[PDB]
Amino acid sequence: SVYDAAAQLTADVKKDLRDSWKVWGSDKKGNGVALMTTLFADNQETIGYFKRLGDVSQGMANDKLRGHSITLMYALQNFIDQLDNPDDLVCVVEKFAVNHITRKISAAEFGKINGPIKKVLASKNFGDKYANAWAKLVAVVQAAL
Amino acid sequence: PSVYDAAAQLTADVKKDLRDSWKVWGSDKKGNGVALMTTLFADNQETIGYFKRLGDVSQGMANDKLRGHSITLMYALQNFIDQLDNPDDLVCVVEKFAVNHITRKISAAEFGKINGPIKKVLASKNFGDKYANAWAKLVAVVQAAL
Ligand code: HEM
Numbered sequence: 001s002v003y004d005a006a007a008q009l010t011a012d013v014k015k016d017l018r019d020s021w022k023v024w025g026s027d028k029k030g031n032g033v034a035l036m037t038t039l040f041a042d043n044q045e046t047i048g049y050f051k052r053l054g055d056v057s058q059g060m061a062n063d064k065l066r067g068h069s070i071t072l073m074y075a076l077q078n079f080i081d082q083l084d085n086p087d088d089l090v091c092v093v094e095k096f097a098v099n100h101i102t103r104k105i106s107a108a109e110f111g112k113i114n115g116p117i118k119k120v121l122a123s124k125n126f127g128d129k130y131a132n133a134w135a136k137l138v139a140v141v142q143a144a145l
Numbered sequence: 146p147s148v149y150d151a152a153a154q155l156t157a158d159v160k161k162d163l164r165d166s167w168k169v170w171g172s173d174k175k176g177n178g179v180a181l182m183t184t185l186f187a188d189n190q191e192t193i194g195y196f197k198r199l200g201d202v203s204q205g206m207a208n209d210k211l212r213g214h215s216i217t218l219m220y221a222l223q224n225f226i227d228q229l230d231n232p233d234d235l236v237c238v239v240e241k242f243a244v245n246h247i248t249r250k251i252s253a254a255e256f257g258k259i260n261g262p263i264k265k266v267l268a269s270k271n272f273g274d275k276y277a278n279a280w281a282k283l284v285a286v287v288q289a290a291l
């Protein structure tokens with residue numbers, strides 16, 4: 001249930017998401033690409049899905065990857081901005097869920113992003129507490145896949 | 146001309162006008178995004194068919210898929226606004242969204258149909274022709290990629 005999953009985003013969780021986003025979302029290009037490179041580096045079996053972007057190993061030097069990465073951070077920005085209204089959060093989550101269903105990405109594989117998120121956040125001094133919060137948000141998308 | 150040529154041609158004045166108008170128009174993404182789409186469908190009814198995935202686009206705010214689409218479109222514009230000072234960054238995100246439309250057979254001319262609606266929504270907030278023209282220049286950067 002995408003709606004029950006959305007209900008998991010309590011006041012304490014929303015705060016942790018906002019607090020960490022103040023830092024993580026401040027450098028969308030830089031952090032977006034780092035998130036993607038981490039995903040590819042630690043989950044090589046997901047690289048094939050990103051064929052359109054060309055050679056993702058080039059990281060920041062890859063223009064299509066950079067564009068994809070920046071845009072991904074705006075999807076998260078979108079989510080953050082919908083935390084006040086469950087209905088709006090759900091409709092945008094569904095929109096992106098469709099994008100991933102077309103790419104044949106399951107709830108389980110979408111969840112492979114949690115490891116990379118925990119890692120990049122940890123590098124910015126935002127521990128398991130924050131990783132767990134972001135996992136709850138990722139779980140809303142998972143519920144829609 | 147290239148997309149970069151269209152992106153690097155955006156002047157300090159055009160960026161100023163884009164930013165000033167976006168501060169207001171982009172502040173309520175849900176409300177103004179849906180208004181933008183509704184306006185496109187009111188004046189360019191021939192484009193309705195392309196949006197069949199969203200369901201009944203005349204349902205406005207009630208239509209959650211239209212709302213989801215509209216809010217996200219406004220974040221695409223947000224993205225654009227945030228990349229104005231770095232042509233390299235603007236071009237790569239413009240190209241990304243260009244692909245989203247190329248795959249749906251949306252031509253440069255068809256994409257440019259969004260200018261009429263933008264001019265009206267901006268006008269409703271008292272941002273006149275100068276601002277409509279500025280936004281037309283940004284839309285043209287995407288057209289350079291279509
Ligand atoms: C925080 C988690 C994630 C977010 C918010 C996210 C967001 C996005 C966005 C905004 C797009 C562009 C959609 C489009 O224009 O069609 C996208 C594309 C894509 N995503 Fe994700 N995504 C996430 C995680 C993942 C993961 C873990 C996978 C794979 C296991 C995945 C696979 C894809 C693929 C293959 C594309 C298409 C790329 C292309 O060919 O342009 N995503 N994602």
Ligand code: HEM
Binds near residue numbers: 099198217245
């Ligand atoms: C300010 C100008 C516009 C921007 C920023 C923009 C942005 C977007 C975005 C972000 C998407 C989602 C892409 C995806 O996830 O696959 C989208 C989808 C789409 N756009 Fe646009 N767009 C603009 C104008 C137009 C115009 C004028 C047309 C039609 C003549 C058009 C036709 C489409 C179609 C058919 C879709 C697919 C909708 C769906 O089935 O989900 N767009 N657009």
